[model samples]
Target: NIEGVCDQRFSGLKEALARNLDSGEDVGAAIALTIDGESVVDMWGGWVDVEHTAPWSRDTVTNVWSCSKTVTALAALMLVDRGLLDLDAPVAQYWPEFAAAGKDRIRVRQLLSHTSGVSGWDQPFTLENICDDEYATARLATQAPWWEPGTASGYHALNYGHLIGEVVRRIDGRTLGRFIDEEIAGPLDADFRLGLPKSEYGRVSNVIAPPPLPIDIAALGMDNIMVKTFTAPPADATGSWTDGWRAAEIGAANGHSNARALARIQSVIACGGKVGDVRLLSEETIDKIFEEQSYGVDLVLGVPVRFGVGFGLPTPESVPFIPEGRICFWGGWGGSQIIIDTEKRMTFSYVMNKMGPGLLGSERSAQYVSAAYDALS
Candidate 1:
């Protein structure tokens, strides 16, 4: 028995693990939940590595890919709360150079909702160019939109963090990584981090790719939103989790966090902007998340994505885990997820070192989400 396992609310989770244990499918995972600003379930199991030498402890962290977007969104929301940003303002207002090449009309809201139409760095972007945040953002800013901005949603994929981060830097004079650390992660004492430090590298777990099956992008159609999102330079899972991957601020795809920290920070949304005594965003400001940004078949992800402000809106096609009304959620490349149910006042997060099939709701995540809702009911 490890710390916090005696709560009994997690017994169903234990049983669920037995099925994984029987099949030897899962390597290690952590699940954390916050209900009305208090942690109710904190559980972890399995080994951190394939060698099985190191146990997946309470503090183990893993690369959580695009699920990191929620954290980046939170930072942007903080800026909005401070009056440092205006959602409807044209992005070119702050990023004057982004006004280049007919992007003058793109608004900040478009970037948040993945409707900016600047999805991938216009073709022929090298890995070196993609790795340099400034170079990548500058190149993306100058490129013509794939479609008219504010007209549709396309998963920004690899470019989201850089796009939004550059806007943040232009206004705040600090990188998104630095702002997130000072304003959110550091003050909340959350383990979620955008740019990891040298000392914490040892505690990071490597991501394992699930069995190979070539993704049939053609079957999904090149014009599909999923294909568009996945076609970006950094979306290839194999190249994404390397050490070089850690050094960059691919906020939409490269955040590293444990379940505990993910849920803890998101509890701010679940609890109406107050987690414990810590108030991050005002309740009135939090309500802005419900402003519908776009809803339709995403041009990039090749799936229906309902978006609000800066968060993934609840949609039947992608996020069955989210119940209707006042919910915001997002997931990573290999199915890491953080769900904030504001109406229910619950924050559920699951992070893992083990890679699983499916980008969003993999079998592993389904079981955890099921167990969590069952506990709530």
Candidate 2:
């Protein structure tokens, strides 16, 4: 529980969550908040499995899907800080093979911003294929771009991580998951982890999707950019929780974390690239996060999304939690979310094993965010 907020404020939020759990709506969850670089809320409850044999302790970790993109983007930005990456430079310059299929002009920034035309796997991809050769799967991404890179935005549903991870590997000589552990997670002392170690498997909470379909992608209008981006790979969500899923580093998905770690790492952005005197990026480099990459209708998400270099910007149609001004945000599949409110100097992260129906914010998250803002206000 958070310290010093009116009992009523937190109570309302807790009650909402309890109601969800009591009704078997939520299996397990965790939510954490950091304001001005100080943690205000750290809490978790429920079971890790459907059999209820494993309790969801405070340390329980689960797959946070695309929330891993935020980490992948951060790793790239670290290289950018060292003058190793140029956002505006064409990606093919670094990855020559990407020049195939008329993709020579796609810039590095476009991939980060989801403006790259490579939104899904063009060739046949199976769980075994992805685990055995992520690089080969990534090469398949070069086949063709759904839209011209940088012309617009499409959610790189399953391939965003590989697109960016490959660049990180090319420049840093390490996978995005490894780079994150050595550079960011280790330094920040953040508990968030990608590619869960075998030791920590005991604490993992297998994800449980909601009963009803979360968002009816088809109903949202298949012609939109967001729909196209998400559905391009029909297999995006089906087999994501298998062992192969955890073994492979899919930056766009398969990040394992809890609220505390998510909020801690994201606090770097909230606190101007420095958290507790541990600086990962300069304020100048951090400022580039807001350099608008694409804005308007999202081809895959089927909504108006505002994107920056490597993060989602505050969009009226996408995320309204982030107030006006410079802020970057992203969410995982099944409703996990992380929001870095630079203007407010706040970082909010919410993760859960009991998946909610909404793709972005859900009733459970709204209550928490609303309570958090009420406290700050």
Candidate 3:
């Protein structure tokens, strides 16, 4: 059964989750919603393991995949809020080594918005290489952009954390994972992490891989941005089951969290950068997120996308259910989603063990998102 509080008005959301679980569409999942700084809905059910022997309890966490980027972006923006980092400043200004290969002009916001064109590492890289944080991050510094920087997004599929995390490390003197642990999650008491320790593995739910991506890589050719980005390190959904993936700081992908934790953390944006007595960003810094940075077809995702400072803005053609307004969101490789609506002071998040098709989102999440909106209306 679903466990957590859901206001009577949003009871339909609980029912939707129930149906998903009953139909076996979601082996395990959690969904959360917050309004005006208060949690209106927070529930989790299903199983942690495929065998259904272990229950996915209230405290269970899972690899949130690309949803990690949202929190990673929040870490960088916090630095901007504190005047420690500049959005428009050349990344080389902070990470001097990044000036290699005519990349001196690549700004920090470009990295955040995936417009820097250094989507993934160059050829000869592999999933194992990215797991080696020092080696992988250093390689990115010596590499060249796959496309022109700041023109359009190529969907920095895998290397987002390495790109932005290095900048954070240079300026803050802390790794992205540690910065998030101490500065963001610690202050907010949110249960989320860029990497996992062996001790906490007991509560982690392994993600079920989706069907092979529908793209035909050989036909697209090597020079294609999507082809290059995905093949450089090659995605291995099963990698999450390894100690290496859980231990490494793959900030763009390997974050371990659940819906309740994400909603609590992202509530900072929905509530103007503060939750209760804690304030991680200034109102002005939060406003910077709405500045459009890239729009049009994403070079990697190959879909119409609109990117703002650090999050994906609403592109109805891409995500029709997400109403247009002062809202920004992004989903994981599977269906994990996080939506922050400053206009409505609302935050909605969904995390699950069973990953569905599609990069931006899946039919399952869309249904829940639409139901939440319907409840609000």
Candidate 1, superposed: residue stretches over 4 Å from native = 1-3, 215-229
Reference-based TM-score, model 1: 0.93
> Which digits, one per residue and each the tens of the lDDT, describe model 1 over residues 1-377?
23345248667876776567446577777778888888888887777788887878878998888788888899898889889999889999999999988999888988889998887776566556666887788887778888888788888878889989998999999999888889888888999888566788878777887667776454565564455456556345656556677788878777778989999988988898877777889987788888888999887666788998778878966777666777888887666879988878888887876678776678888887877777766
Mind giving the per-residue lDDT tens digits that candidate 2 earns over 48-157? 87688977787788888878889989999999998999988888888888888998988898989888888776535545665654654556545877777778787888
Q: lDDT by residue for model 3 over 1-377, one digit each (tens)?
A: 98888889898999999999999999999999999889999989899877997988989999998889999999999999989999989999999999999899999999989999799888888778988998999999898888888778999888899999999999999999999999988999999999889999889989999988677565667778788888877677898888888889989998999998898999999999888999998889999999888898999999899999879999999999899999999889889899999998999999999989877788888988998999998
- Reference-based TM-score of each model: 0.93, 0.90, 0.98
**What is the descending lDDT order?**
3, 1, 2
Residue 271 of candidate 2: its Cα lDDT? Answer: 92
Q: Listing every candidate in turn, what is its Cα RMSD in Å to the true structure after a full C-alpha superposition?
A: 2.2, 3.2, 1.2
Clashes of each: 8, 9, 0
Worst 10 residues of 2 by lDDT: 1-10
TM-score comparison, 1 vs 3, better candidate: 3
